[PDB]
Design an enzyme around this catalytic site. Sequence first.
Site, PDB file in Angstrom:
ATOM      1  CG  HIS A  22      -0.647   0.376   2.483  1.00 30.91           C
ATOM      2  ND1 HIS A  22      -0.836  -0.461   3.578  1.00 30.91           N
ATOM      3  CD2 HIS A  22      -0.074   1.497   2.954  1.00 30.91           C
ATOM      4  CE1 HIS A  22      -0.409   0.135   4.663  1.00 30.91           C
ATOM      5  NE2 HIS A  22       0.071   1.342   4.312  1.00 30.91           N
ATOM      6  N   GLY A  46       2.417   6.988   9.036  1.00 30.78           N
ATOM      7  CA  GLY A  46       3.824   6.942   8.600  1.00 30.78           C
ATOM      8  C   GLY A  46       4.562   5.802   9.269  1.00 30.78           C
ATOM      9  CB  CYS A  52       2.493   1.476   7.222  1.00 32.72           C
ATOM     10  SG  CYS A  52       0.816   1.823   7.832  1.00 32.72           S
TER      11      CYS A  52
END
EC number: 3.4.19.12
Lengths: 304, 304
Positions: A41, A143, A145
């Site tokens: 993603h 931020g 991830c």
Amino acid sequence: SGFRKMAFPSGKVEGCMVQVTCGTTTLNGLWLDDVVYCPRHVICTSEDMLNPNYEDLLIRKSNHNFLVQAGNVQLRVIGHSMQNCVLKLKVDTANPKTPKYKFVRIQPGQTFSVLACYNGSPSGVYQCAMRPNFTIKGSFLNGSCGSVGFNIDYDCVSFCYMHHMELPTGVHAGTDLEGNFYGPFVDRQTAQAAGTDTTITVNVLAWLYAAVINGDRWFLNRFTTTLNDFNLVAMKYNYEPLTQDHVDILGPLSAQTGIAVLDMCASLKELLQNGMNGRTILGSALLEDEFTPFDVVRQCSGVT
Amino acid sequence: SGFRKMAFPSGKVEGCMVQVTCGTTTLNGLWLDDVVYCPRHVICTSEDMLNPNYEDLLIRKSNHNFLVQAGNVQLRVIGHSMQNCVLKLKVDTANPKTPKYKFVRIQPGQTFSVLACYNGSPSGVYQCAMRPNFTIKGSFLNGSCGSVGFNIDYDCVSFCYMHHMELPTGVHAGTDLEGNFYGPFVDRQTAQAAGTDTTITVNVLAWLYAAVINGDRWFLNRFTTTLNDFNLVAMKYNYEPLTQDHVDILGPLSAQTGIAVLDMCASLKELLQNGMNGRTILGSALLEDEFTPFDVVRQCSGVT
Ligand SMILES: CC(=O)Nc1ccc(Oc2ncccn2)cc1
Ligand SMILES: CC(=O)Nc1ccc(Oc2ncccn2)cc1
């Protein structure tokens, strides 16, 4: 003496963290050898996230659309593939700080350290468990991830988790390092309701052992119980069933303390039925379930 | 979202840990530049510890009686001095991994990460507070002495603690890196009774802010209070007095949440008087006091 929620030293994982940018999305990647692992993603806008077609989004991306920065030095991307829900970016440089490592898929109830990162920079480390509903109760802002969960055995980092999603209920979902989600979760911004968050019974018993070993003994009672009897009380209290495997796993703590596992089960049964009556166990007002039997033995013996 | 007891990444401190041996005593040292810092009780037998004369014990020791091992490479000791309760061993090699660092003496209520070590090898990291009675509630086994407490500001490690003693009550006492004990404690195996372990009120309020920010709002009430009124309830509950300095320090959390500090004080007052009624706040059944206002702002904003 004393008993603490302890993470593994984070240094070996700090040396693997990079920043991955694809257009306007920045998140964290893991640099092991000449591969950088990150949530797929990274290629999504927040609009994409409502219903992403990853294969279709991905075709528009080239190696040069992936900006990998290790400290303040850019790595050159020479390949990219999707594996399940992770991107693997082949870079032209092997991470000089790659530790010995394994990718392992943990079972629910197993604990791990998280190095929380932002723009490829570590902010903190904390200890988690994979919940029985395959969520984790993390601390993860926008931020974060690509932040990873790990165990260390002496010098070998076993990577078990990469952070992908905050579910609308504020709990966390992620993948192993093969990009397979723990549980039924998907990298889509949609209704995803976790199941029952049951208490990891075997971890609670381990922590009651840890307590006895550290002088907190007030909850030790005169009773025993049987697996079947205990398990009726467990069911009632949304505790995981206790198996003979769990009994066996607690054997060494049983031996060290001289408290039979079923006696400690009967102690737990009374705590469930009577509550704490305003008392604490190792400075907690509730029954802690994020220590494994292995964690209690490690911390109580001093393994490095 | 989510809120975790988070330590600083430990990597920069892992690179400073060595093993110091003097005869049959092994413990941990901190290698910064060409100096190794360690508890001066490295020179003691457990018999020495009952009533050590450090100056007299020390005269019998030469540079070569101090065995400093960094990984599996011995460092050459070219000088030793006693500073308060720490030994400084001058070695012929500057630690190549010395980070930017400061030695700071923290105030009670201030939080820090501990890298728990054995034979100069890190086993884990956890977050602490200096208690108002100048103890810490650590996890420290035999051989853990010389393990250090630290904060990190971006790249600068501020060392605030070195582990020296377990008090007979199983709480921990130690020094700053100038070798001065926090509180009235001494490196002698004798009766040393800590005072009242009061709750760090300003840290509890910070954590109630952190909770509100993460969606745990059930405890927000319709009341306010005054510093003097709140402080009568604090006294009764062995909570530290709240000062206008603490109010000021909570200002930004106040601003971000739009809950006046005295309203949150009145909320805390009701929690103290009524208890939790079997509910939890950020997954705790008691009021957490080992988050500073700075810790809540860092973790809630994502500082790296
Ligand atoms: C699946 C998709 O949508 N796009 C894509 C296709 C083929 C790809 O080639 C590749 N390259 C190196 C190793 C393995 N695979 C990469 C990305
Ligand atoms: C105080 C004691 O009992 N023995 C001792 C005396 C003088 C010492 O010399 C010294 N050397 C280098 C720097 C600073 N000081 C060291 C150890």
